[PDB]
Amino acid sequence: TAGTPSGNGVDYQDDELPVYQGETTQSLQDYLMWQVELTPFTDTDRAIATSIVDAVDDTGYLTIQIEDIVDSIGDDEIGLEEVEAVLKRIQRFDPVGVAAKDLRDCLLI
Amino acid sequence: PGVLKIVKVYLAVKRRIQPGDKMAGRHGNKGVISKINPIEDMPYDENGTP
Amino acid sequence: EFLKPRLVDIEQVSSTHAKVTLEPLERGFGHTLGNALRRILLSSMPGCAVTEVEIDGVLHEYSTKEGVQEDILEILLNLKGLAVRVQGKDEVILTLNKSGIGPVTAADITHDGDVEIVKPQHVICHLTDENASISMRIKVQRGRGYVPASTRIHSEEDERPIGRLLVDACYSPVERIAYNVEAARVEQRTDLDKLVIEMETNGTIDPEEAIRRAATILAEQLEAFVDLRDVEFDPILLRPVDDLELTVRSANCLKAEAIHYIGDLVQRTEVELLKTPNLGKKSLTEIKDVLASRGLSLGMRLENWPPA
C-alpha cells in the first residue's frame, strides 16, 4: 500500500455503562417541527401543521394531496380553505419553498 | 480496495499571546497573564527603559 | 504671575539620539510637564510603516524562494523594521527589484518622488545563487499606533488576490524617552528648574516637531476642561393595510375595527377577533391566508407603536 488514508472519524462512549449510548441527528422534519413550535399557531393550526409536515418527503415536496390531508384531519370546520392558509404559512420556513405541492408552486414561492 | 482518491489539506495559523495564555519559567514558577499593559504604563528606570 | 517655559538649546547627539531642553520652570511643573510629554510621545505619535508586501513568485508567508537564504517569514520580519518618510502621501508604493549575489538593502529600493530612507543599510534579504532574481512591491501607510494584521476586517470588503502578504504595522517612530529635572541657572528668581528630554527614535521624526505635536495634543485635550458646564423596524411592517388585496367585505370591517397598518393587524388573537361583528369564519381564514403569504402569522407581539 503506497498511500494509506488516515483513520476516519470514530468514537465510542466511555466512562458510561451503556456503551456507545447514542447521538441525536437533526433531519428536515425535526427542523420543521422546531420552527413550527416557535410561531403563534392555534391548537387546530398546530394539528394541521404537524399533519402537513409529517407528509414532507426527503426532497422537501409534499407527497400527499391537500384534499387527502383534509380527509386525514377528519373533523368539521377544517375545510380546505384553512389548510391552504396553514400550508402557505408553513412554506415560508428556513428552506424557503419547502412543502410545495408541485414545481410551479415552489418557483412561485 | 474500496477507496479511489485521497486528498490531504494542511492549514497553518499564528497564535499570539493573550491574557488567557499560560507562561512559566523553569524554576517551577507558573501562571497566566492577567493584562497586556501599554508601554507608557509599565515601570521604568532612570534611563527610560520599561 | 507664572513664568512660562521656552524651548531653548535643542541638540542632536546622533541620527536617533536627541536632546530637548526647556529652561524656565516653576517649583513643581517640571515633573508634571515631563511625565505628560513622555506619556503623550510614547502613546500617540504619527508615523509611516510597511502595511503589506507582494513578492513576485511567492504565495504565502510559509513558503521558500529558490536562491534566497531566508524564508518569506523572515523577509517580512526584516521589512517590518524599515524606516521611511513620505511627504503628501499616505499610500505610497515602494517597488524593489534586484538580482545578483550578496545581501540586498534599502539602498536599492527604487527612488520614489518624495520618499526618504533614513537608514540605507537595513538588510532585508540575502541572495545566494548567481541567476536568482527578487522583485517585490511594498505598500507604506501612515498611522498612529499598533495595528495587528488580524483586527482589520474592512480590508476584506474588496476581494484580495492570493499572493498579497499582510504584515503588522507599528507606526510609532519613538522607541525610548527619558527626562530629568535640574536646577536652573537663573539667579534673579528664587528657585527655578530646567527640563531635559532625551529621546531615541528611528530617525523618522524631528525632536522639535515631536515636542510640538505632543504639546498640541495636550492643549487640545485640556481645552475641554476649561469649560465644564453640563450642570416596528422591519419594512414588511408599517406598510398601508391596503397592500394585501383583501376582499371588499373585509375592507369595510378593517376600517370599522380601527386597523390601518399591516403591523397593527398582526397583534390580534383569533379568539377575540372572531367576536368582531360580521367577520365570518370563511372570510377570516382569507385574512390569515393572505397574511400567511407574507410570512407574518396572526398574533405577533411587538413592544412599541409609532403613529407612522
Is the CB of C39 inside 8 Å of chain B's CB atoms?
Answer: yes
Q: Contact A99/A52 with Cβ under 8 angstroms?
A: yes
Residues of A in contact with C281 (CB under 8 A): 77
Indicate yes or no: CB of C198 within 8 angstroms of CB of B49: no
**CA gap C136, C116 in Å, rounded:** 18
Is the CB of C59 inside 8 Å of chain B's CB atoms?
Answer: no
Residue C42, burial from CB neighbour count under 10 angstroms (0-12, 13-18, 19+):
buried
Q: Contact C199/C176 with Cβ under 8 angstroms?
A: yes
∠ CA(C201), CA(C202), CA(C208), 5° rounding? 45
Q: Contact A65/A59 with Cβ under 8 angstroms?
A: no
Q: Contact C78/C122 with Cβ under 8 angstroms?
A: yes
Nearest of C157, C60, C68 to residue B13 by alpha carbon = C60
Q: Which helix (H) or strand (E) holds C23?
A: strand C17-25
Nearest-CB residue to C289 (from A39, A42, A88): A88
Strand partners, C293: none
All cell numbers assigned to C151 = 483586527
Q: Which helix (H) or strand (E) holds C95?
A: strand C91-99
Provide long-range contacts, Cβ within 8 A and 24+ apart, for A100-108.
A100/A60, A100/A61, A100/A62, A101/A61, A101/A62, A101/A66, A102/A61, A106/A61
Helices (H) and strands (E) in chain B, counts: 0, 2
Give me the torsion for CA of B9, B15, B21, B23, rounded to 10°.
Answer: 100
The answer for residues whose C-beta is within 8 angstroms of residue A20's C-beta and 6 or more apart is A12, A13
> Resolution, in Å, please?
3.4
Residues of A with CB under 8 A from a CB of C: 39-42, 77, 81-82, 84-86, 88-89, 92
The answer for residues whose C-beta is within 8 angstroms of residue C141's C-beta and 6 or more apart is C48, C49, C51, C90, C91, C169
Q: Contact B24/B31 with Cβ under 8 angstroms?
A: yes
Is the CB of B3 inside 8 Å of chain A's CB atoms?
Answer: yes
Q: Contact B42/C39 with Cβ under 8 angstroms?
A: no
The answer for residues whose C-beta is within 8 angstroms of residue C11's C-beta and 6 or more apart is C18, C19, C20, C21
For residue B41, give the DSSP letter. G
The answer for residues whose C-beta is within 8 angstroms of residue C168's C-beta and 6 or more apart is C80, C146, C147, C148, C149
Indicate yes or no: CB of C292 within 8 angstroms of CB of A86: yes
Nearest of C284, C271, C288 to residue A43 by alpha carbon = C271
Chain C closest-CA separation from residue A26 CA (Å):
24
The answer for residues whose C-beta is within 8 angstroms of residue B23's C-beta and 6 or more apart is B17, B30, B31, B32, B33
Provide long-range contacts, Cβ within 8 A and 24+ apart, for C302-308.
C302/C232, C302/C263, C302/C267, C304/C232, C305/C232, C305/C263, C305/C264, C306/C232, C308/C238
A neighbours by CB contacts (3+ pairs under 8 Å): B, C
Indicate yes or no: CB of A81 within 8 angstroms of CB of C289: yes
**Secondary structure of residue C242 in the 3-state scheme:** coil
For residue B23, give the DSSP letter. E
Is the CB of C236 inside 8 Å of chain B's CB atoms?
Answer: no
Residues of B in contact with A3 (CB under 8 A): 6
The answer for residues whose C-beta is within 8 angstroms of residue C233's C-beta and 6 or more apart is none
